[PDB]
Design an enzyme around this catalytic site. Structure first.
Site, mmCIF file in Angstrom:
data_model
loop_
_atom_site.group_PDB
_atom_site.id
_atom_site.type_symbol
_atom_site.label_atom_id
_atom_site.label_comp_id
_atom_site.label_asym_id
_atom_site.label_seq_id
_atom_site.Cartn_x
_atom_site.Cartn_y
_atom_site.Cartn_z
ATOM 1 C CD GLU A 11 13.034 10.323 22.185
ATOM 2 O OE1 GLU A 11 14.108 9.748 21.910
ATOM 3 O OE2 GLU A 11 11.929 9.954 21.733
ATOM 4 C CG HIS A 49 5.969 -0.240 12.996
ATOM 5 N ND1 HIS A 49 5.201 0.902 13.080
ATOM 6 C CD2 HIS A 49 6.941 -0.109 13.928
ATOM 7 C CE1 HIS A 49 5.688 1.689 14.022
ATOM 8 N NE2 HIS A 49 6.744 1.099 14.553
#
EC number: 3.4.17.23
Lengths: 597, 97
Positions: A357, A487
């Site tokens: 991250e 997705h």
């Protein structure tokens, strides 16, 4: 007087007006994710529509500056994205109906659920409900009920909504002078304007298909090993030369095999590396987790994090009063404002996820000096690739022992590393076949090579040949497998995950040559080495302003993707799996089916 | 100045001149708001193609990065002319004996 001066003027005033509206649009989404309220839900739509309509208003003036009279490469790249009209090229009905299909398919995905066959009253939603149960479920019928019943009310119902998504999106690519909608996503890799570095859109189909051929010997051995451990459970349905069941992959769609690492452990008599029990005794919290990772980027030469970054971070979810999404995400708004929204627990994965991250934020700091339109990764695979190289360095026993997580007397040998490579192989080698399989299928359906009736016939036919997976229950053309995927239903690029594996490994092999590390690749650690950071920082600040083919040469020295770093990093595991598979058959056959005997 | 000028919602009171037909001369201040003409297309004060508004507002919010945070700058111009000198440094005035 020339159009060049007029183009540069339109681009200078566009970055300022777009930076203000884009920052408010992203800021509105932040307050909505961090806190769920009636004010944030509306601010996200108002700020989102104001910025969405901004590009639509600027696109009208962008098409008035032809790129034939512009001799500047950086100028055409900025106008290359603005020249696209998006959904404006579509008809009024096809343009408004497109958003209805995307919102309808996305709503059924979140609202979709499968009621428990044994408990009709209890009905669990897919996420988390259906995704968590399928992870640890060892039952053959329990996994088949949720796996088979999901696509019945989802895959079948989403077929008519998916058909419109295929016809609607194709009209947009044709209006853009694209061969089809499949070529639309390949445009991200398109490279033109530089002599010798030009990369055609159609060349991606050959590269992904040529590089996958070298991964077969590594995946075939990894598949034969997984089938041997699970062969004792169901010898009838699991053939030695056959394929493994589709619902036993460890999760719903079989994207990652990490869930099978428990039963696939080569050696159970030796300890495994875990920082969970070590961090508990050290008494660390979310505040010191990111602080320890910030010192890692400084050891390689990368600048530290700004004061506002660590002050505005969200370290947990304060109950249900103020709720946020725990899904780790790196949010880049603008004007030097960087934040990360994640739920931080004490685990060995959160520590590795912290570096990932933070890698996105650290990556956004290098090219932050570029124009608004020029701020981005060279492609869709470099976003998460730069963050994986940081996590791979933390998982090495050398980095853990440096900060004091792992005991200094921990024995590191083949038995210890062989078990570590298998865990990373399932998450890496496992996604590659599934990525090339699903991504290649979408390109064939959108291109028109597969009739509507053969959608499912070609789906499983190509599945046993690629990933070697067979369907327990045969399906007709009514069901749609990709329709249930996250997705595929959200209209996001599914190819970016395949290239991410090849790019993250190339940098791992190149960055370790600069730091002058010796031995196996998985033993490499980039910490304390300031020479590798200076080489990677050059491309970090370039972004997409330069062709990804050129920027990739300044790091790994290659003009395209290569599987060589994939064989070396997995080389120690390949040598061990080759010996364990001598008693079994390496590879699988496409003529075997669980219902066909 | 992020603790004063910058406020929630943004402060547009502070603007700047984005475009000008040339570079300003030393110690020159031009407040003209006349529309900037990029090309040869007439403007006549009406925004449009090849016609833009030169003044732009600085986005000011406390959540912005430290690099873009507004900084109040005070520039002192020291010029010695033929006229007599007045402004001088401080004094001492020590003890007397």
């Amino acid at each position: 007087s020339t159009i060049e001066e007029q183009a540069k003027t339109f681009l200078d005033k566009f970055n300022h007006e777009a930076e203000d509206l884009f920052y408010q649009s992203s800021l509105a989404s932040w307050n909505y994710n961090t806190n769920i309220t009636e004010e944030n839900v509306q601010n996200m739509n108002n700020a989102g529509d104001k910025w969405s309509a901004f590009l639509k208003e600027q696109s009208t003036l962008a098409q008035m500056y032809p790129l034939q009279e512009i001799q500047n490469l950086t100028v055409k790249l900025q106008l290359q994205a603005l020249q696209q009209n998006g959904s404006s090229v579509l008809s009024e009905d096809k343009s408004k109906r497109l958003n209805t299909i995307l919102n309808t398919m996305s709503t059924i995905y979140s609202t979709g659920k499968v009621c428990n066959p044994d408990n009709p009253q209890e009905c669990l939603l897919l996420e988390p409900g259906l995704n968590e149960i399928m992870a640890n479920s060892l039952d053959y019928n329990e996994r088949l009920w949720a796996w088979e019943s999901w696509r019945s009310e989802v895959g079948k119902q989403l077929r008519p909504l998916y058909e419109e998504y295929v016809v609607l999106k194709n009209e947009m690519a044709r209006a853009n002078h694209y061969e089809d909608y499949g070529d639309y996503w390949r445009g991200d890799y398109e490279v033109n304007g530089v002599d010798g570095y030009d990369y055609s859109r159609g060349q991606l189909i050959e590269d992904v298909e040529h590089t996958f051929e070298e991964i077969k010997p590594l995946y075939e051995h990894l598949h034969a090993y997984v089938r041997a451990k699970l062969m004792n459970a169901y010898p009838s349905y699991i053939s030695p030369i056959g394929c493994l069941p589709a619902h036993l992959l460890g999760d719903m769609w079989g994207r990652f095999w990490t869930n099978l690492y428990s039963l696939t452990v080569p050696f159970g008599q030796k300890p495994n590396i875990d920082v969970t029990d070590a961090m508990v005794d050290q008494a660390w919290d979310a505040q010191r987790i990111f602080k320890e990772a910030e010192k890692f980027f400084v050891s390689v030469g990368l600048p530290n994090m700004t004061q506002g970054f660590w002050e505005n971070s969200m370290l947990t979810d304060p109950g249900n009063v103020q709720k946020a999404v725990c899904h780790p995400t790196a949010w880049d708004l603008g004007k030097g404002d960087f934040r990360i929204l994640m739920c931080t627990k004490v685990t060995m994965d959160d520590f590795l996820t912290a570096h990932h991250e933070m890698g996105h934020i650290q990556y956004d700091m290098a090219y932050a000096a570029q124009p608004f339109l020029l701020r981005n990764g060279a492609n869709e695979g470099f976003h998460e690739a730069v963050g994986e190289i940081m996590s791979l360095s933390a998982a090495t026993p050398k980095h853990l022992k440096s900060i004091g997580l792992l005991s200094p007397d921990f024995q590191e040998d083949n038995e210890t590393e062989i078990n570590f490579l298998l865990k990373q192989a399932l998450t890496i080698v496992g996604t590659l076949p599934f990525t090339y399989m699903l991504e290649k299928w979408r390109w064939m359906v959108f291109k028109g090579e597969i009739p509507k009736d053969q959608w499912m016939k070609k789906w499983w036919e190509m599945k046993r040949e690629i990933v070697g997976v067979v369907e327990p229950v045969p399906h007709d053309e009514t069901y749609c497998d990709p329709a249930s995927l996250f997705h595929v239903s959200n209209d996001y690029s599914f190819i970016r995950y395949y290239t991410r594996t090849l790019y993250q490994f190339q940098f791992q092999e190149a960055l370790c040559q600069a730091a002058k590390h010796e031995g196996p690749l998985h033993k490499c650690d980039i910490s304390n080495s300031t020479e590798a950071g200076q080489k990677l920082f050059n491309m970090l600040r370039l972004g997409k302003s330069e062709p990804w083919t050129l920027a990739l040469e300044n790091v790994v020295g290659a003009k395209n993707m290569n599987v060589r770093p994939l064989l070396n990093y997995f080389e120690p595991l390949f040598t061990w799996l080759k010996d364990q598979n001598k008693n079994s058959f390496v590879g699988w056959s496409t003529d075997w089916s669980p219902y066909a005997d | 100045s992020n603790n004063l000028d910058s406020k929630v919602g943004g402060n547009y009171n502070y603007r700047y001149r984005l475009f000008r037909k040339s570079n300003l001369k030393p110690f020159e201040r031009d407040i003209s708001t006349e529309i900037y003409q990029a090309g040869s297309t007439p403007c006549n004060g009406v925004q449009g193609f090849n016609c833009y508004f030169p003044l732009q507002s600085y986005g000011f919010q406390p959540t912005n990065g430290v690099g873009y945070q507004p900084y109040r700058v005070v520039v002192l111009s020291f010029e010695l002319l033929h006229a007599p000198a007045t402004v001088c440094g401080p004094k001492k005035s020590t003890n007397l004996v």
